Amino acid sequence: AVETFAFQAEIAQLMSLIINTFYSNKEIFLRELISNSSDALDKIRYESLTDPSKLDSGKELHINLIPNKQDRTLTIVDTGIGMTKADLINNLGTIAKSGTKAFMEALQAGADISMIGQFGVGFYSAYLVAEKVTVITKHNDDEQYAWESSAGGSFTVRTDTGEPMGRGTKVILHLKEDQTEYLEERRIKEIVKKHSQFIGYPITLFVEK
Ligand SMILES: O=c1[nH]nc(-c2cc(Br)c(O)cc2O)n1-c1ccccc1F
């Protein structure tokens, strides 16, 4: 069973702004997704400090970057706290209506799209480079769910029958045809070194055969 939801009008407007605005500095999407993974890893670590059983679903706290040139996908995997179905539906765990309002006021006053993370809606920067995004997630308190959207005002949620993850989130970016530089090892290494140098978890860039 696949459930289709409409985005809140303000989030659909955020997504169209990201897709339509001429903005060359698209590489910041990766910093934003790694930042969200770091935050999710911090959340499960914090819960584990008082309840070690929180890590029964996996003790390793890490981030993997998996490019696949055949599928034209870049996957960002983390073993953080994950998201429940309600978190996915509620804008992937954000207060995105108020974040979008603040971001749009900042843009009108001179900010630029790279500042999106300061408004707590950095996930949507994925649409600078992806035509479709799939988010697979597993939280200790819920089942494994797949969220997906190609923008256009809607998203889907379903229970995922695919490869079980113990706990965490996988963001699969189905890249736009002209954004394949983000599958190149040297380009990803450059972006991680430039923008993600103070992330306190191992970031492993996988290589391809
Ligand atoms: O909580 C939680 N869990 N999980 C999650 C996620 C998401 C996303 Br979109 C991404 O990319 C990743 C991840 O990991 N989370 C969150 C949300 C928001 C913000 C922050 C944070 F951490």
Residue numbers in the entry: 16 to 224
Article excerpt on this structure:
For 7 of the 20 compounds, it was possible to obtain crystal structures of the complexes bound to N-HSP90 with loop-in and helical (8, 14, 16, 18, and 20) conformations of the α3-helix region (loop- and helix-binders, respectively). The main difference between the structures is the conformation of residues 104–111, which can adopt either helical or loop-in conformations. All ligands occupy the ADP-binding site and form typical interactions, which include hydrogen bonds of the 2-hydroxyl group of the resorcinol ring with the side chain of D93 and with a water molecule that generally mediates interactions with G97. The 4-hydroxyl group of the resorcinol ring forms a hydrogen bond with S52 through another ordered water molecule. Similarly, compounds 2–5 were assigned as loop-in binders based on the similarity in size of their R1 substituent to compounds 1 and 6, for which crystal structures were determined. Interestingly, there is a strong difference in the binding thermodynamics of loop-in and helix-binding compounds. Specifically, “loop-in” binding compounds are primarily enthalpically driven, with favorable or small entropic contributions. The majority of the helix-binders (7–20) have lower association and dissociation rate constants for binding to WT N-HSP90 than the loop-binders (1–6), suggesting different binding mechanisms.
Here we report the investigation of the role of protein flexibility in the modulation of binding kinetics and equilibrium thermodynamics of drug binding to heat shock protein 90 (HSP90). HSP90 is one of the most abundant proteins in the cytoplasm of eukaryotic cells, comprising 2–5% of cytosolic protein under non-stressed conditions. It is a ubiquitous molecular chaperone intimately involved in a variety of pathways, including cell signaling, proliferation and survival, and protein folding. The N-terminal domain of HSP90 (N-HSP90) contains the nucleotide-binding site, which has been the target site for drugs interfering with ATP binding and ATPase activity. The unbound N-HSP90 has a highly flexible lid segment comprising residues 107–14137.
